[PDB]
Amino acid sequence: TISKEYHIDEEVGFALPNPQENLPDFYNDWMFIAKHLPDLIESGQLRERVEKLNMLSIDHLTDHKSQRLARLVLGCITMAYVWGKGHGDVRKVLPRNIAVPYCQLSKKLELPPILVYADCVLANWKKKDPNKPLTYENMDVLFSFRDGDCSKGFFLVSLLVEIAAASAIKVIPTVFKAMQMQERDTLLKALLEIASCLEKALQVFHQIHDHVNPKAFFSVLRIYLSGWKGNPQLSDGLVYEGFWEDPKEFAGGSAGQSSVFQCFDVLLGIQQTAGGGHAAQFLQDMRRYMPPAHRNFLCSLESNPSVREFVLSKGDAGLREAYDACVKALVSLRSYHLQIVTKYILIPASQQTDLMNFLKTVRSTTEKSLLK
Amino acid sequence: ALEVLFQGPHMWTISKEYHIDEEVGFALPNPQENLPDFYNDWMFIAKHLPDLIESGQLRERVEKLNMLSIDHLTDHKSQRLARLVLGCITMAYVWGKGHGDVRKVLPRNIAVPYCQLSKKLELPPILVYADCVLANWKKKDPNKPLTYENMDVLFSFRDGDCSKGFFLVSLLVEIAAASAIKVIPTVFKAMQMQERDTLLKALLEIASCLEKALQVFHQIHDHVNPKAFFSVLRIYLSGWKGNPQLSDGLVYEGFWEDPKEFAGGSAGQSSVFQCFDVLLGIQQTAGGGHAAQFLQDMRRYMPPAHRNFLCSLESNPSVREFVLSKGDAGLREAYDACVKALVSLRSYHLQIVTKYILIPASQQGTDLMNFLKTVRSTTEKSLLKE
Numbered sequence: 001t002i003s004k005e006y007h008i009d010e011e012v013g014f015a016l017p018n019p020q021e022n023l024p025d026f027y028n029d030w031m032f033i034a035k036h037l038p039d040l041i042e043s044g045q046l047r048e049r050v051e052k053l054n055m056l057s058i059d060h061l062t063d064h065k066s067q068r069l070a071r072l073v074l075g076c077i078t079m080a081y082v083w084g085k086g087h088g089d090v091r092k093v094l095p096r097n098i099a100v101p102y103c104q105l106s107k108k109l110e111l112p113p114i115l116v117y118a119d120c121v122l123a124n125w126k127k128k129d130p131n132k133p134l135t136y137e138n139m140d141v142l143f144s145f146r147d148g149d150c151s152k153g154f155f156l157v158s159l160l161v162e163i164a165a166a167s168a169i170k171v172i173p174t175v176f177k178a179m180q181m182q183e184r185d186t187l188l189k190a191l192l193e194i195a196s197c198l199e200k201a202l203q204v205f206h207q208i209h210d211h212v213n214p215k216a217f218f219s220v221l222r223i224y225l226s227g228w229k230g231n232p233q234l235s236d237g238l239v240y241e242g243f244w245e246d247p248k249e250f251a252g253g254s255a256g257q258s259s260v261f262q263c264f265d266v267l268l269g270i271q272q273t274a275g276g277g278h279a280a281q282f283l284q285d286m287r288r289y290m291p292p293a294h295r296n297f298l299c300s301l302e303s304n305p306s307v308r309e310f311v312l313s314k315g316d317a318g319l320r321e322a323y324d325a326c327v328k329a330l331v332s333l334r335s336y337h338l339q340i341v342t343k344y345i346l347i348p349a350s351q352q353t354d355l356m357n358f359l360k361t362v363r364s365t366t367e368k369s370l371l372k
Numbered sequence: 373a374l375e376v377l378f379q380g381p382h383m384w385t386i387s388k389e390y391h392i393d394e395e396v397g398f399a400l401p402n403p404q405e406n407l408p409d410f411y412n413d414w415m416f417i418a419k420h421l422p423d424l425i426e427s428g429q430l431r432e433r434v435e436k437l438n439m440l441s442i443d444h445l446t447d448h449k450s451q452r453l454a455r456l457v458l459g460c461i462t463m464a465y466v467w468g469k470g471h472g473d474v475r476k477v478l479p480r481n482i483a484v485p486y487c488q489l490s491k492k493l494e495l496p497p498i499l500v501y502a503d504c505v506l507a508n509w510k511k512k513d514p515n516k517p518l519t520y521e522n523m524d525v526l527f528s529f530r531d532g533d534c535s536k537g538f539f540l541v542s543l544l545v546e547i548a549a550a551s552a553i554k555v556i557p558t559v560f561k562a563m564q565m566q567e568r569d570t571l572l573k574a575l576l577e578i579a580s581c582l583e584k585a586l587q588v589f590h591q592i593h594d595h596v597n598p599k600a601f602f603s604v605l606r607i608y609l610s611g612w613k614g615n616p617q618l619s620d621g622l623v624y625e626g627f628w629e630d631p632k633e634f635a636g637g638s639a640g641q642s643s644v645f646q647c648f649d650v651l652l653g654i655q656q657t658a659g660g661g662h663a664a665q666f667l668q669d670m671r672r673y674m675p676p677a678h679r680n681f682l683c684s685l686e687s688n689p690s691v692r693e694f695v696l697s698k699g700d701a702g703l704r705e706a707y708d709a710c711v712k713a714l715v716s717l718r719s720y721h722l723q724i725v726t727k728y729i730l731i732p733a734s735q736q737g738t739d740l741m742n743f744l745k746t747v748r749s750t751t752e753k754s755l756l757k758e
């Protein structure tokens with residue numbers, strides 16, 4: 001089985017298992033702002049509460065779980081401070097009392113000082129009842145931006161798909177051992193089990209329609225998910241007062257930072273990061289926005305022999321069909337996700353396309369990997 | 373690679389799967405000089421680029437070629453030679469005499485086998501450092517050592533372009549730096565086993581190798597002249613990514629519908645310099661700045677096994693964090709000797725770029741100087757003591 005140094009959980013995969021909900025009492029001033037973002041933003045009191053904070057030291061965040069929660073807390077606060085009510089009045093400077101500990105904690109965890117997928121999805125969750133299973137009914141997010149932003153449905157359904165896809169990660173060492181030991185039947189069973197997991201993850205995706213509405217997602221949630229890299233509203237980036245002199249550019253939170261989808265593209269030899277195109281550049285860049293242990297895991301998968309080249313060289317129809325079932329399952333996930341992006345982004349944008357092209361390129365690359 | 377999945381990133385040995393040679397490091401050991409007779413038409417053009425370009429006959433010879441199948445290139449060495457052959461031909465076809473008459477479409481009979489062979493080797497269809505430096509060499513006498521006098525390049529662009537001196541001296545520096553790569557597993561084993569004296573000896577041995585590599589660099593002046601380098605060689609080293617002359621990239625006829633953008637050959641694609649920056653925790657690829665983005669992007673222009681080696685070094689524990697935490701002057705000084713050796717190499721290289729690029733450019737820009745100054749500055753700021 002996969003090394004503990006990669007920080008992949010047997011149950012939740014790349015998600016942070018049982019994330020911390022409360023920080024030490026020393027950080028109550030950060031927690032108050034983070035827990036009341038909807039109210040402070042709406043009332044125009046948020047920027048003042050952030051500006052009134054004292055610079056708190058990161059030294060009292062003793063373990064990884066408390067450091068991850070503080071990163072989620074500070075990152076949510078930073079998005080609300082920069083974007084405000086989300087109507088054009090942006091802030092181009094982040095106050096030193098929040099920027100200094102945010103950048104120091106970010107340097108410690110090897111993550112950029114901006115809200116990432118590992119913060120808002122992987123560490124932004126809790127079980128309502130610890131004795132009940134990981135189902136939507138028994139779960140909640142830790143932080144939201146606005147009342148009615150559908151951040152619970154959006155972040156939780158992504159997390160549930162991450163968790164569903166994680167049951168196929170345990171099969172990865174079985175695949176590489178079967179190839180090395182030349183165990184054809186073992187490899188075929190392993191590939192069919194990965195396909196089975198990815199097919200099941202598509203059913204999990206269907207839940208998006210019951211917990212997210214297009215108007216609230218597009219007009220409200222979208223604003224706080226935005227970053228400051230190539231953003232016309234913050235063309236030079238954000239100033240991290242007291243940490244860097246010049247404004248720094250960082251891309252906003254993205255599911256392109258999910259390690260579970262990138263690890264199946266690497267496993268199946270779908271060269272998403274090859275060819276010098278825009279989609280390849282984006283997905284490669286998003287690896288530096290992943291937790292270092294997860295970024296290391298992706299490297300290690302790439303360093304292993306190609307499953308695609310192995311299957312292509314055997315002249316075995318059963319093995320080729322098991323490989324194609326894995327690729328077809330990823331194509332179906334991405335095709336369904338394209339229909340979702342049309343419903344939640346494309347159509348609401350018309351009632352008020354570069355993202356669609358990115359998703360269509362990634363999907364096309366997956367489709368072109370079928371051996372047929 | 374299978375044990376790294378179960379036990380974790382622990383590079384206590386340099387696996388043969390990384391394709392690092394004990395003698396030449398990241399360079400391709402004893403590269404192939406001749407292709408099978410089936411490819412004689414490719415070899416004739418590649419071997420006579422200076423003459424065909426000068427006479428205006430090159431584009432016609434390329435356009436008259438038949439589409440040759442890549443199936444007859446059976447091993448890695450023949451595939452690497454063919455990539456160097458086709459890449460040199462592509463630079464000459466696109467740039468011509470180097471005076472503004474560019475070609476925006478690469479003929480299918482050369483673009484199809486170039487892109488197929490590139491896809492096979494996981495390298496972009498443009499001449500890279502692993503082609504023009506690492507695989508562009510031969511020993512004149514196999515029984516004599518790896519010295520400039522006993523070596524030659526396989527391909528050149530123009531008569532008097534100094535490509536032999538430029539490519540061979542880079543190769544000799546790569547080879548000199550390679551003797552420090554064998555010490556990398558000694559460093560990670562010493563840290564794991566907490567063998568302080570072993571670690572100190574290992575760090576001083578790496579510094580010794582990098583210091584010796586600076587002396588190898590001095591040979592550049594005897595084999596390259598600034599006028600020929602700047603006015604002639606520079607042209608053929610250019611790519612088509614952010615290039616005003618080919619703003620949309622090159623069309624690889626019969627392979628892709630749209631023009632694709634690929635950056636030109638760069639020593640930023642050298643794995644030996646990037647591996648010591650990673651080893652010493654000089655975070656060249658961090659911060660989101662232009663230098664960081666460039667060096668990260670250049671990893672996809674490296675051979676896949678070498679790109680894998682770099683990310684495996686990043687996955688391993690930090691030598692810098694280990695040395696910083698020990699309160700040991702001798703260990704800090706051995707680490708600083710390694711960093712100071714890289715600062716000296718980059719400072720000397722800045723003087724070289726002034727001589728060969730800056731001054732000739734002025735006798736008729738500084739964006740490359742700023743890139744080199746940022747990389748040098750990052751190295752200098754990694755010293756634990758000034």
Ligand code: HEM
Binds near residue numbers: 158205253258345362
């Ligand atoms: C309200 C529903 C959703 C919308 C509107 C949506 C939107 C988007 C957009 C705009 C992108 C492009 C990258 C970017 O801009 O950051 C993207 C990428 C992606 N999304 Fe979603 N998404 C939704 C639900 C989900 C769910 C539930 C998952 C499951 C984990 C998910 C997984 C991905 C992945 C893996 C990518 C990266 C590209 C790929 O590998 O295909 N998305 N999404």
Ligand code: HEM
Binds near residue numbers: 546645725743
């Ligand atoms: C005629 C002499 C030389 C000139 C004019 C020259 C020029 C350049 C230029 C313009 C760059 C910036 C990146 C790019 O534009 O692609 C560069 C980078 C670099 N060069 Fe050279 N170079 C010379 C000799 C050498 C030699 C002999 C080596 C040895 C292998 C070398 C190693 C490097 C490295 C490692 C980089 C990447 C940046 C760094 O890590 O500092 N150069 N060079």
Ligand SMILES: O[C@@H](c1cn(-c2ccccc2)nn1)c1c(Cl)ccc2cncn12
Binds near residue numbers: 121225255
């Ligand atoms: O990529 C982001 C993201 C950004 N946007 C967006 C919306 C409208 C206009 C521009 C960007 N939509 N999603 C993302 C996050 Cl942060 C979390 C989970 C997830 C699932 N699929 C995508 N996910």
Ligand SMILES: O[C@@H](c1cn(-c2ccccc2)nn1)c1c(Cl)ccc2cncn12
Binds near residue numbers: 501640
């Ligand atoms: O980085 C390239 C390179 C690019 N340029 C250049 C100069 C002027 C205008 C445009 C490009 N010069 N050298 C390079 C190659 Cl391809 C091979 C060895 C080497 C050593 N140092 C740099 N090396």
